[PDB]
Amino acid sequence: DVAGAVIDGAGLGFDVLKTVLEALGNVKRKIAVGIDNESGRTWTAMNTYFRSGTSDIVLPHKVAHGKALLYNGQKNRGPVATGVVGVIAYSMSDGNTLAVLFSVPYDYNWYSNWWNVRVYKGQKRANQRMYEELYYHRSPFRGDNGWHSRSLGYGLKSRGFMNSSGHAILEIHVTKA
């Protein structure tokens, strides 16, 4: 229980991500993240940048082709009106970086769920700079209960889904172009 689980790629789906959410218990804002590695490359965890919110687990360290990683986060605990906003960075065996943005706001009167995926040339750690590119400059997807596809370059693509609520799930599949 130091890291999030690694499961058979084919196992990843809505019910797995709801089980992850349920284990966090009834906190106001929380996310279950599932990324299926069908990239044909091994991933090695770099880091998670939390702009807001926290996790009691670290990224699964090694995620082979054919494996999905499970991850989670939740709002900072106590009377702060914040959500859970951060960036996951994995190193790929080609020397590049797979980056995932998740954004779950406190106030749905004015803000909505957002996610993003991208491949960076070389070894790039998750930080505020990467958050700002993925959020403000690289056409994030809305957590609109819709599936979205994108060509990542570097011979990969993504297909993913995020729901629209404060109890958020983010399912992503990286496959071969």
Author numbering: 3 to 179
Paper text:
Strongly influenced by negative selection, actinoporins have conserved important functional sites to ensure the preservation of their mechanism of pore formation, a complex process involving many different steps. The steps leading to pore formation comprise (1) the binding of the toxins to the cell membrane, (2) toxin diffusion across the membrane plane, (3) protein oligomerization, and (4) translocation of the N-terminal α-helices through the lipid bilayer.
Relevant functional areas such as the lipid-binding region (contoured by a hydrophobic loop and the C-terminal α-helix) and the pore-forming N-terminal α-helix were conserved. When considering only the differences among fragaceatoxins, it is observed that FraE shared a high identity (98%) with FraC, explaining their similar activity above. The most stable isoforms were FraA and FraB as judged by their higher TM values (TMFraA = 65 ± 1 °C, TMFraB = 62 ± 2 °C), followed by FraC, FraD, and FraE (TMFraC = 53 ± 3 °C, TMFraD = 47 ± 1 °C, and TMFraE = 51 ± 1 °C). Differences in the exponential dependencies of the lag time on the protein concentration distinguish the more cooperative FraC and FraE from the other fragaceatoxin isoforms. In particular, these two proteins are predicted to have regions of larger, local intrinsic disorder, suggesting an underlying local flexibility that may enhance binding cooperativity. The overall hemolytic activities, however, are lower, implying that protein flexibility may obstruct other steps during the pore-forming process. Moreover, FraC and FraE share an identical N-terminal helix, although the hemolysis produced by the latter is considerably faster. Given the high sequence similarity between FraC and FraE, other possibilities such as long-range interactions may help to explain kinetic differences, such as those described for Stn-II. Similar mechanisms may apply to the arginine/aspartate difference at position 129 of FraC versus FraE.
